[PDB]
Amino acid sequence: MPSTLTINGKAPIVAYAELIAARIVNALAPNSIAIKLVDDKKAPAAKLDDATEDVFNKITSKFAAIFDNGDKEQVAKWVNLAQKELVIKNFAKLSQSLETLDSQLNLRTFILGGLKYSAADVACWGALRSNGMCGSIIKNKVDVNVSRWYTLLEMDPIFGEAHDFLSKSLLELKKSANVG
Secondary structure (H helix, E strand, O other): OOEEEEEEOOOOOOOHHHHHHHHHHHHHOOOOEEEEEEOOOOOOOEEEOOEOOOHHHHHHHHOOOOOOOOOHHHHHHHHHHHHHHHOOOOHHHHHHHHHHHHHHOOOOOOOOOOOOOOHHHHHHHHHHHHOOOHHHHHHHOOOHHHHHHHHHHHOOHHHHOHHHHHHHHHHHHHHHHOOO
16 A cells, blocks of 8 residues: 655645655656645645655655665755755855755766766755746856756656646646535
8 A cells, every 4th residue: 555645735835856756756666655635835745644744855765765876975965955955045045055056066967976866866856946046046147057957857757747747636636626
């Protein structure tokens, strides 16, 4: 019986990282996680089974067979940056954090430099997807490595259609609540 991941469409910072993690898991091990929707700003952004705290890392550690690339210390640093810094809508702070990631991606396709993306990439990509402030910073401060890495991952439906998946599912949720 699958784990359940609840994703909240009225969360002011949408749990993209968590959702993409789950998409990766089910892509490689179908029916591992059942996705459930809520649409209420007075509810957790995401919940794995009954866990509301440290949800990303709980998916990641639960499905360790899938998230099997990256020294865990090094993955944690970048997951921390995404969850503690890249989601925060502060221009100066976001500028600095984006510079750190840009420098990291200078000689690398993915954050930790494998052929495969890792949890580090999932967390940072999700964080930036959730944060509307970053687009212009990335452009105007010429974080072109971030730009190219973000576009690369965006062309992968697992990442780039997560928003559309969430918004069509929420539409169908409203349509079902509204049938007479």
